[PDB]
C-alpha cells in the first residue's frame, strides 16, 4: 500500500535538510505528495527562506508534488498534529537529539514525535 | 538515488509481520534488495522467516534473503545493518510509547538511537 502523503519537518538546519532530501526521494518513489513543515514561535522572513531551500532540496531529489507549511507552535505538536490533519502515511524527521542523556530524559523532537505519532515514522540518520 | 538494501526485523509476531509488509513494499518501490532478519538465542526460526518471505513477496518484493542472527534483537539488527551496508532498517513499534518501554528498553527506540542507518519505525500496533 504505497505512501500517498509524506510529511517532513525542517528547522533550516543542514542536518534537517538531509531529512528533506530523504523524504523527497521517498515521495518521488511512492509518487506521493510531500509536505514540508517548519514549526516556529513568531519578522518571519527566515521561515520562508527555510521552506524555499527545503523545497529546492526536495525537488532536486525527485519530488514533484510539494507543499510548504509554516506552522505556528512547537515542533513536536506542529508535526504530529499536521500529520493527523492531512492523514499522513509517513512522517519524516532527522535524529538530532536522540542520543544525549538530556534529550533522552527531557525530550527531543525525534523521540517525542516517534512516541506520539499515529503514523509510520522515518528517522533519518542525519547526525 | 534510492534505498538499495533494506533490512526488516521480525520475531514472528503479527505486529512485526506488518513491519515486513511495509518493508517489502518499500523495497519494491525502491528497486532494493530486502533482508529479513530474526534475532534469537540458542527451528521455530525458519517457520518465522518463511512466513515473512511470503508476506514480503505478497508486498511486491522479489529479491529476498532470510537471515537468522544470534543475540539480542537490537545488537543483532544493528550489526547486520552494518555488515550488509543497509540503507534502511525497518522495525515495528511495540513498546515504543509505553513506560514499560522506557524502563526495559524497546527495540525501536534502541534501534533508532544505535543504528547508523535510517530507521523506519512502522506503526504496527
Ligand atoms: N522547528 C522545527 N520544525 C520542524 N521540524 C523540526 C523543527 N525542529 C526540529 N525538527 C525536526 O527534528 C529533527 C532533529 O534532527 P534534524 O536536525 O536532522 O531534523 C530535525 C527536524 O526534522
Ligand atoms: N527477535 C527479533 N528479531 C528481529 N526483530 C525484532 C525481534 N524482536 C522485536 N523485533 C523488532 O521490534 C519490533 C517491535 O514491534 P513489532 O512487534 O511490530 O516488530 C518488531 C520487530 O521489527
Ligand atoms: Cl549512547
Ligand atoms: Cl504507559
Automatic annotation (TrEMBL), chain A:
Q: Which InterPro entries match?
A: Rossmann-like_a/b/a_fold, Universal_stress_UspA, UspA
Q: Which UniProt keywords apply?
A: Nucleotide-binding
Please list the residues that bind 3',5'-cyclic AMP: 9, 15, 39, 94, 96, 126
Say which domain of life the source belongs to. Answer: Bacteria
Q: What span is annotated as the signal peptide, if there is one?
A: none
Against CDD domains, the record matches this protein to: USP-like
Task: Show the GO MF annotations.
Answer: nucleotide binding
Which Gene3D superfamilies has this protein been placed in?
Answer: HUPs
Q: Which PANTHER family match?
A: STRESS RESPONSE PROTEIN NHAX, UNIVERSAL STRESS PROTEIN UP12
What is the recorded name of this protein?
Answer: Universal stress protein family protein, putative
Q: Which organism is it from?
A: Mycolicibacterium smegmatis (strain ATCC 700084 / mc(2)155)
Automatic annotation (TrEMBL), chain B:
State what protein this is by name. Universal stress protein family protein, putative
Q: Where does the signal sequence lie?
A: none
Domain called UspA: residue spans: 3-123
Alphabetic keyword roster: Nucleotide-binding
Q: Which domain of life is it from?
A: Bacteria
InterPro entries per the UniProt record, alphabetical: Rossmann-like_a/b/a_fold, Universal_stress_UspA, UspA
Q: Provide a Gene Ontology MF annotation, just one.
A: nucleotide binding
**Which residues does 3',5'-cyclic AMP bind?**
9, 15, 39, 92, 94, 124
Q: Which family does it belong to?
A: Belongs to the universal stress protein A family.
Amino acid at each position: 500500500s504505497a505512501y500517498q502523503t509524506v510529511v517532513v519537518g525542517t528547522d533550516g538546519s543542514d542536518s534537517s535538510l538531509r531529512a528533506v532530501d530523504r523524504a523527497g526521494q521517498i515521495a518521488a518513489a511512492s509518487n506521493a505528495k510531500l509536505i514540508i513543515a517548519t514549526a516556529y514561535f513568531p519578522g518571519n522572513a527566515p521561515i520562508y527562506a527555510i521552506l524555499r531551500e527545503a523545497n529546492d532540496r526536495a525537488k532536486a531529489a525527485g519530488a514533484t508534488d510539494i507543499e510548504e507549511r509554516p506552522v505556528v507552535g512547537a515542533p513536536v505538536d506542529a508535526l504530529v498534529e499536521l500529520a493527523d490533519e492531512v492523514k499522513a502515511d509517513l512522517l519524516v524527521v532527522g535524529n538530532v537529539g536522540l542520543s544525549t542523556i538530556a534529550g533522552r530524559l527531557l525530550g527531543s523532537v525525534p523521540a517525542n514525535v516517534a512516541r506520539r505519532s499515529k503514523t509510520d515514522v522515518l528517522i533519518v540518520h542525519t547526525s
